Design a protein around this ligand. Structure first.
Ligand code: 9CS
Ligand code: MG
Length: 268
């Protein structure tokens, strides 16, 4: 029997999602199981559990981000620079690798999209506009980004069948941690400004490994190692959403744990 919206809403209530909550979901749809009306059933259940006063924040990114094509260069390669489409936040589809649910969240009516092409976030709720802006190049996940305002606004991380590597909010901990040898990257993004395509080159913290030992491909990063340690030492509400196992995590608490975790292991 495919899961109905109402069943999902009640499981989300059992897990601890309250009216008015600020929630960031990481969803594996395969672990959830079949839904009454496909992935939209889970989106509707999230909106309903969070209520008319709550908020959803999702890391959707961009399907056609020229990250690899421009990473390491002082300027976009000529072939890339002439033909690559500019980031249109109203029509650019989400990145499928971060979850198939994100394209349904971003096309939901009233959803707002942040301006960062590679680190794009989508928000639904009365505080959506406050969440998504500003989001500038050079502040992907660090202070002054949507994740920062999410952390200050009692955000909860809702992992539905996702692994510990999926906690996007922990990249904030990498940004602010006082440790030596933090890796940075340089890449270019095509932005749409006053109707016109403009290429912008910036540098930011390497979101694929803040230090060399976490940048390996094979290859657990700092985010996964922090999350595994956290989940082994912390009481966290656990339960099923659909057929997937889910955890509701206090975002400020795990980020705070991540800063101490990184700073205890690497001198300043
Ligand atoms: N390093 C190990 C981790 O890698 C990926 O997670 C990363 C993404 O790679 C990164 O993405 C960036 O780099 C990609 C590859 O160059 C580009 O395609 C993409 N546009 C660009 O946003 C996110 N920003 C942060 C996230 N933790 C895997 N999901 C995760 O399971 C694994 O633990
Ligand atoms: Mg409010």
């Amino acid at each position: 029997t495919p899961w109905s919206k109402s069943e999902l809403v009640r499981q989300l209530r059992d897990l601890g999602v309250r009216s008015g909550d600020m929630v960031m979901p990481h969803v594996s749809l395969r672990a959830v199981g079949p839904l009454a009306d496909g992935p939209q059933t889970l989106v509707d259940a999230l909106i309903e559990a969070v209520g008319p006063t709550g908020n959803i924040l999702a890391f959707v990114s961009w399907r056609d981000s020229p990250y690899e094509q421009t990473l390491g260069h002082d300027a976009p390669p000529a072939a890339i620079a002439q033909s690559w489409p500019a980031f249109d936040p109203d029509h650019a589809p989400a990145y499928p690798g971060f979850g198939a649910i994100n394209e349904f969240i971003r096309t939901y009516p009233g959803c707002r999209r942040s301006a960062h092409p590679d680190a794009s976030m989508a928000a639904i709720g009365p505080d959506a506009a406050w969440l998504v802006a500003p989001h500038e190049m050079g502040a992907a996940y660090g202070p002054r980004s949507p994740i920062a305002r999410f952390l200050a606004h009692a955000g909860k991380i809702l992992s539905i069948g996702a692994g510990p590597d999926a906690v996007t909010a922990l990249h904030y901990a990498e940004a602010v941690a006082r440790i030596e040898g933090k890796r940075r990257v340089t890449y270019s993004m095509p932005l749409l400004r006053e109707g016109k395509r403009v290429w912008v080159t910036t540098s930011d913290w390497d979101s694929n490994g803040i230090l060399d030992e976490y940048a390996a491909p094979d290859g657990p990063d700092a985010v996964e190692r922090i999350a595994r340690d956290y989940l082994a030492r912390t009481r966290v509400a656990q339960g099923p959403v659909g057929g997937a196992q889910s955890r509701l995590i206090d975002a400020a608490d795990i980020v705070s744990f991540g800063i101490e975790w990184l700073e205890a292991r690497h001198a300043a």
